[PDB]
Structures are given as structure tokens and as C-alpha cells.
Amino acid sequence: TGYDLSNSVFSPDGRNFQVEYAVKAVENGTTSIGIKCNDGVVFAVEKLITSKLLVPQKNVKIQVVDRHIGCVYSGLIPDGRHLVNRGREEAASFKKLYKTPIPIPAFADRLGQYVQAHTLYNSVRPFGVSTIFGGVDKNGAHLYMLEPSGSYWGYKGAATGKGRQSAKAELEKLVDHHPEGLSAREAVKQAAKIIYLAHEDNKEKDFELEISWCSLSETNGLHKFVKGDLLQEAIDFAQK
Amino acid sequence: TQQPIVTGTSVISMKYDNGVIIAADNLGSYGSLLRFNGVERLIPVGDNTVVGISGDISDMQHIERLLKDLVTENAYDNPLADAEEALEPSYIFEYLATVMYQRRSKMNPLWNAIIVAGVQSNGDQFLRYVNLLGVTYSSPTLATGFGAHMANPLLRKVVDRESDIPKTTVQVAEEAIVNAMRVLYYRDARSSRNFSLAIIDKNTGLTFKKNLQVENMKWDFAKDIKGYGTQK
């Protein structure tokens, strides 16, 4: 009843309703997906073309942290940009202190602490974004998803946004059918296919597909967008 | 920095018709002790810029960290980072000069002298100098410290005016640079026989040569020198 009007107020059942409302805000965004392959990660996202006056291939959504971390988010885009700026500051501080690129689990913990710190007071608002991020470090490839409550986990495949249910079903089938794993290019094709399938929930507007990847054998452990013939091949595979 | 401890020697550079050439030795000296061998003092920032640093080695490493941070920050939210939005030698020099002058104004200088060399996007050569006081200047040939007394007179023989730049080929410029390095090894007591060189050309790419050694020297006539004055 009255327990939903302020952040960091426990309900009688032990709930924080402002965080749940932030999750509701997240559920109204576009679909973002991440796939973990044998030696890297692939991030894919759908961008709605509200008007034909939007310049194609501009308005980039996927963002980069340091030179090896990829991040995408669903929800209120400015909140995601705020979180990415904070993550860039954290990575810079870690690199300055310890002369090594920040490991992915450490970056995930720093982001989680920052998100969680916004559920502790009623003078601030929880972040309205769910973030799928990851990359490659000395231990290998890592993929994580972070929720508005500050909780995060590592995933074999993650999906968020309005079309999250169908994307999760497709990811589960993909994981079940490939116990050994997937290559980076095959992961790019599958991400294109899954984004196209998940868009079928929202047929009212056209969409553009954006894909990025970070792999040891394809980008030498750096994060790079997919823009050339590979992007067209993935689009053709998805539309097939 | 109030007093340098580990220091590198001069860096020399010149412009030719198509690009720029820069060079520096690989020695870090510790108060008349030739302590560290294998110190790279030329830092390539991208594909169109090389920064050559002389003076305190710790401040040089700090500057290298700053340059890497600048590249990383430029790459953020910039799909044209490998395109018309890439960093340029002018940007890098302006940033470095701002840092040097601000730190001088706080009585906490970076005890260094820096030459930035490269090629702009339009193809024009870039070569400029800034020191620990923030003093900046440009010339067809540049050198700091000891080289400024011995390398500049030789290099100005090849390129004496701005009009001589189009006449100077890369081969002549590189030969002049190598000869200047040999002269410095002859007469500079804080110098090393091993050095590195970098060529930035508008048509071809950046060429970074390491492990270059001063070649055949003239020492035979020393056998003719007897004792001072009247001996023998």
C-alpha cells in the first residue's frame, strides 16, 4: 500500500516495490541478447525505426568499456549510458592502480555494487535498465547479466527486454543442441536469427539489427562491431 | 619532479618532402652511470604520430600512460575512430603542451623535453617541440638537449629553409639522421651505440626500426697519437 512510494522501504513481506517498478520499466524496452561461445562473447540488439527520417547505421546502442568489454542494455537508455560511464571510470581506475585490464568478474562486481548502492536510500532512484555485458580476460570468456536490484549472474546465454521469453526459449534450445559449444561466427548468425525471431512479437515497426563480438581467435581478445560481409551473411541467415 | 634521477639523452628529428623522421637512443643513465640499456624512448600513438621524449624516465612512463589513456578515451562512442575521427599529431601536441604548462604553473613539472612528429590527415607534415617549461616551437629540424648543439647544425645542412623540404628525399634524410646519431655517439658521454628510428610517410605507413647500431667508425688514427706535447 504505502510501502511503494519511497525507495529503500521494506514492505511487510520483505519487498522493495520501487525496484519492481524499475523492472517494469525494463520490460518495456527492446530485446538485447548475449551469447557465450567457445572463445568469446557475442552481443546483439534490435533498434526500432520509429521514423524513416532516422539516419541508418547511426544511433549506436552497443557500447565498449576499456578495449575488451562489451555492454548492451534494455530499458531507459540514458540510465544505461550513465552506468557505462561509471564502468569506464572503474576500469580506468583499476588499470591505473594495477597495470592490467580489469578482469570481467571484478568489473561485474563493481557495476553490481554501484547499482545496489542506489537501492539503499530514498533520495535516489533505482536504475531502470537490465544490462548484458562481458568480454575476454586471462581466464577466458565471461558473460554476465545485471538487474535493477543490483543482482547479477554469469550466463551461458542471456536475454532481456520485451521479447525476452522467445529469446530465452531460442537460447535454451541453442544450448541444448550444442553441448560442445559454438564458434564466434556461428554465434553471430544465431544471434541474428534469435533477434529476428524475437522481433516477431512487435510487428508494428521495422527494426535494425546491431551485432558486436569479442573473441580470442577472431578479434585477438578485443571488442569489435560486425559491419562488413559477415553482418550481411548473418542477416540473410536470419531472414532465411 | 624537482630533480631528475634516471635520464635519457637527446631526440633528433627532421622533415622531408613526403614525411618526417625521428630517432633516439636506448639508454637510461643514472648520474654518470650507464645503468639501463634497452629503454624505448619513441612512442607511436596510432599510425600517424610518434612522440620522442628526453629527460626523466619515470615522467616519460607517466606520459606514455597518459597517451594510452587518451587513445582509449578517443575510441569511446566513436564509430569513426579508425577514420576521419582518429587522433591527429596536432591534437596530441596540444594536449601534451597543455599538460606541461599546467604542471609548470603548479611548480611540479614533468622534467622532460618532447618532440611530436607525424603526418596530418591532409598530408602536411607535423613536427613540434615542447619542454618542461611549456615552451613550444616548430622548425624543419628539431633536437633537444645535447643534440640541439650538434645534430641541428648537420641537419640544417640538408634542410636549411622551408623551400628545401620538397627537394629532400627520404634516403637523404635518413642518411643525415644516422650520421647525426653517429656524431652524438662520438661526442656525447651519456649516449649509447644502440638507438631506434621512426619514419612517418604520407603514402606508406609508419616504419618503426629498432635495434639500430652505430656503424663503422673512425678509430684507426688513434694509434698515431702519442703522449701529450713532447713525448716520443
The DSSP-derived string for chain A is -GGGSSTT---TTS--HHHHHHHHHHHTS--EEEEE-SSEEEEEEEEEE-STTSPTT-S---EEETTTEEEEEEE-HHHHHHHHHHHHHHHHHHHHHHSSPPPHHHHHHHHHHHHHGGGS-SSS----EEEEEEEEETTEEEEEEE-TTS-EEE-SEEEESTTHHHHHHHHHHHHHH-SS---HHHHHHHHHHHHHHHHTT--SSEEEEEEEEEEHHHHTTEEEE--SHHHHHHHHHHH-
> From CA A22, how far away is CA A115, in angstroms rounded?
12
The 3-state DSSP class for residue B37 equals: strand
CB contact under 8 A, B76 and A88: yes
Coil, strand or helix at B4 = coil
How many residues are present in chain A? Answer: 240
Of the candidates A69, A73, A61, the one whose C-alpha atom is nearest the C-alpha of residue A92 is A69
Of A63, A67, A92, the CB nearest to B77: A63
**Contact: B79, A66; criterion CB under 8 Å:** no
User: Does the beta-carbon distance from B75 to A66 stay under 8 Å?
Assistant: no
Inform me whether the C-beta atom of residue B77 falls under 8 Å from chain A C-beta atoms: yes
Nearest to A46 by CA among A189, A194, A236: A194
Closest by alpha carbon to A131, among A168, A107, A160, A98? Answer: A160
Question: CB atoms < 10 A from the CB of B169, how many?
Answer: 12
Domain B1-232: top CATH class: alpha beta
Instruction: Name residues whose C-beta falls within 8 Å of residue B69's C-beta, 6 or more positions apart in sequence.
Output: A92
In whole angstroms, how far apart are CA B133 and each of A43, B61, B107? 48, 19, 10
Residues of chain B contacting A92 with CB distance shorter than 8 Å: 69, 72
One-letter amino acid for residue B114 of the chain: I
Q: Is B80 on the interface with A (CB under 8 A)?
A: no
Cross-strand pairs, A95: none
Annotate A99-111 with b (16+ C-beta within 10 A) or e (fewer): eebbbbeebbebb
User: Please, how many CA atoms are within 13 Å of residue A29, restricted to the half-sphere of its CB?
Assistant: 27
Contact state of A92 with B75 under an 8 Å Cβ cutoff: no
Give DSSP secondary structure letters for B158-199.
Answer: H--SGGGTTT--HHHHHHHHHHHHHHHHHH-TT--SEEEEEE
Distance of CA A10 to the CA centre of its chain: 29
Query: Nearest CA to B197 among B10, B7, B9, B12?
Result: B12
Are A164 and A31 a contacting pair, CB within 8 Å?
A: yes
Burial grade of B21 (CB within 10 A; 0-12, 13-18, 19 or more): buried
Q: Is the dihedral of CA A99, A102, A103, A105 positive or negative?
A: positive
Picking from B20, B9, B18, the residue whose alpha carbon sits closest to that of residue B142 is B20
Backbone angles phi, psi at B162, to 5 degrees: -65, -25
**DSSP tag of B81:** T
Report in angstroms the alpha-carbon separations of B15 from A127, B45, B95: 54, 18, 22
Clarify whether A31 is annotated catalytic.
Answer: no
The strands making up B19-25's β-sheet, listed across from edge to edge, are B141-143, B11-15, B19-25, B194-201, B207-213
- CA dist B17 and A55 (Å) reads 41
What's the grid cell of residue B13?
628529428
Task: Report how far residue B182's alpha carbon sits from residue B23's, in angstroms, rounded to the nearest whole number.
Answer: 12
Q: Which three cell numbers stand for residue A22?
A: 524499475
Angle of CA points A73, A79, A82, to nearest 5°:
100
* Three cell numbers, residue B168: 629532400
CA B180, CA B203: separation in Å to the nearest integer?
A: 26
> Fold for domain A1-240?
Glutamine Phosphoribosylpyrophosphate, subunit 1, domain 1 (3.60.20)
- Let me know: does A126 contact A76? Beta carbons within 8 Å: no
- Between CA B77 and CA B6 the distance in angstroms is 39
Experimental method, per PDB record: cryo-EM
Cell reading at B94: 596540444
Dihedral (CA of A128, A167, A215, A156) sign: positive
Judged by DSSP in three states, B96 sits in: helix
Resolution of the structure, angstroms: 2.0
Of B72, B77, B79, nearest to A66 by CB-CB distance is: B72
Give the cell for residue A135. Answer: 568480454
Distance (Å, rounded) from C-alpha B74 to C-alpha B98?
17
H/E run at residue B15: strand B11-15
The minimal CB distance from B76 to the residues A64, A96, A225 is found for A64
